[model samples]
Target chain A: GMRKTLKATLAEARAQVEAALKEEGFGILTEIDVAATLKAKLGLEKPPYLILGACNPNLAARALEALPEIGLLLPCNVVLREAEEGVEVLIQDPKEMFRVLPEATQRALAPVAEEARTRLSRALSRL
Target chain B: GMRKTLKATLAEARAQVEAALKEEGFGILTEIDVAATLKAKLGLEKPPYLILGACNPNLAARALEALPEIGLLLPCNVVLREAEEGVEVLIQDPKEMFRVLPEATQRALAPVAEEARTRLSRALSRL
Candidate 1:
């Protein structure tokens, strides 16, 4: 309900994300254009959607050690989807996701997960 | 260790950080040129270092609810200092910091902290 908004064109949004990541110390390991992929592969009618797989090796290594299976959520996800008028960024909570894991693993992974979530949210909100 | 690197001049570093923050959805709330401050105020010889204070309303609010005292750490921090060869960016891990907070607070603040950390780290790394 209390979603923060940023005023920028889609190109600006993309550029902003790129810039923020650089300033904050992150690498986007993978990028997937959901709209393009869907249109080309699935032949579906959908808005422009892009997913960026981001990672910070230092934090990620800690996460992996806590729960190897956590690789399933590796490279934090940042989604850019087209809205009626512009674009909206959707980010997941790695800390929240890890909540479903074992308590020992959760305890170990909490820091890494929380850090990842904050970084992603900061990027989205700042732009 | 295995830290990531990006090549950019000092001016380029600052500009790049500005651009990155814009793309990712952030504004430069505070900027402190550590080197400039030290030279002008403290009369100390130091390399060029700068710190940017960044914040997102949504994430900050969530964090506030979780821990009022967390305000002591409000507005995420990103540091840029001159390296032997070039400029290096230093980012803090909020998730790691929150690990020392209360469990309930940690649970509530984990997502906000993680997202912020990841976004900031991403900005630094990308630049």
Candidate 2:
């Protein structure tokens, strides 16, 4: 599974994820309102979901300076979706998602990725 | 490369991508300010970049109802970052992303994926 987690409410889970990320030096940079988006554009309906793009300051500073396309692979995304129980929270793994990045970029981001992994791991377990 | 594209200006490419998606019943629901966010939140600087969240209403409806985590996999993303020419444009491939989905959900969205491919293929050709 990309990221598996406990059943929880969207509000509580997002709150926790953001708090956990903050503890790890990641700040929520962007939050996309997917359901509201679909509704407005297509008159479609769906359960609530959000795309949270969070970045660790120190890691991001170095990576953003090192590579041009780094932002595409920059921040780790924490996705929250509606579940029958509460909400399902999943953390994005940058290394795995951007697995095909160039060698130079990979090398530059290696430590950042490892550090991010720890922060996210701690975040998920604490949740 | 996760996605490779012509080196072009972010503005022109994004306009084209959004127009293409709109023709196919997709909309740019959200655009993230990656560089600005990093600058403001982390005191880091980066080249211009954006993450475009696109959704096809019909496809989204089928998948949203089909699986609990569809939104996590929902819509499609178009990433833009600086390039030598202007800004390189890259579209998110949903199938590659949600490849690990449970069998039931996979079967349900095959048609959606295929249909999206057709529209995107045409869009790509036009570009």
Candidate 3:
């Protein structure tokens, strides 16, 4: 239920976060400029918001070989939203999220998800 | 809070839903057999569960071209979980989900997301 809340601004981690992902072999395959998209499509405004798709090659490749469609849940979603303190960063509990996967696959996927989480938090610290 | 609950079994809608999505230029790009995945991964058995990556090509293509990494948010996610009565399916509200995007982009994407919802429910009706 709880995703990490960063005491920093989105500006603090904009590019900084992507850099953090790399140290752990995780790379951003996709980034959603929600703010820009909303403004372009809706002419609306809101706090800085972004959704980044971060993936680790080794882990994802293996998982993909095992389950091709897993890309659906791949590149674990990390949402960067405005928080009370500063910014809120989070990667949902992959454990619960993938609970329907094969236990062995889930087991295999654990450390990978964990690595993603660890590296994400590590990036936040940098912020 | 609002996923369509069906009095039918998952078996009834599995293929039905995919067929329904096809009518709207959307297809099941990814299908996570939650029940199988969980059983294989944890040896735990639960009622039917699944997560489908539903994408409508026309809408998705235009949107993706506008913003490549937008693929992160491209495929609308549809969740089918066991409801107390039978089954429940839902495609989340993209308006709120992508509020950070420009209003124009949101407007363009709105109907696409709406079509997804409509067709998904259409599949449910068949169920």
Every model: iRMSD:
16.1, 3.1, 9.7
User: What's the distance in Å from true for residue B21, model 3?
Assistant: 8.4
Give each model a TM-score: 0.47, 0.75, 0.50
Best-matching candidate per TM-score: 2
Candidates 1 and 2, the one with greater DockQ: 2
The TM-score obtained for chain B by all candidates, in the order given, is: 0.83, 0.86, 0.74
> What lDDT score belongs to each candidate, Candidate 1 first?
0.59, 0.69, 0.60
Candidate 2 clash pair list: A8-A86, A8-A87, B8-B86, B8-B87
Q: Can you list each candidate's DockQ? A: 0.02, 0.31, 0.07
- Fnat of each prediction? 0.00, 0.28, 0.04
Off by over 4 Å in 3: A100-105, B1-127
Using lDDT, give the best candidate's number.
Answer: 2
Candidate 1 residues B1-127, lDDT tens each? 1133346788887788778866665556556554554455446565666666555555655564454345434455556666676866655456755654568878877778778877766766666
Candidate 2 docking class:
acceptable
In model 2, how many backbone clashes occur?
A: 4
Evaluating just chain A, the predictions reach TM-scores of 0.85, 0.88, 0.77
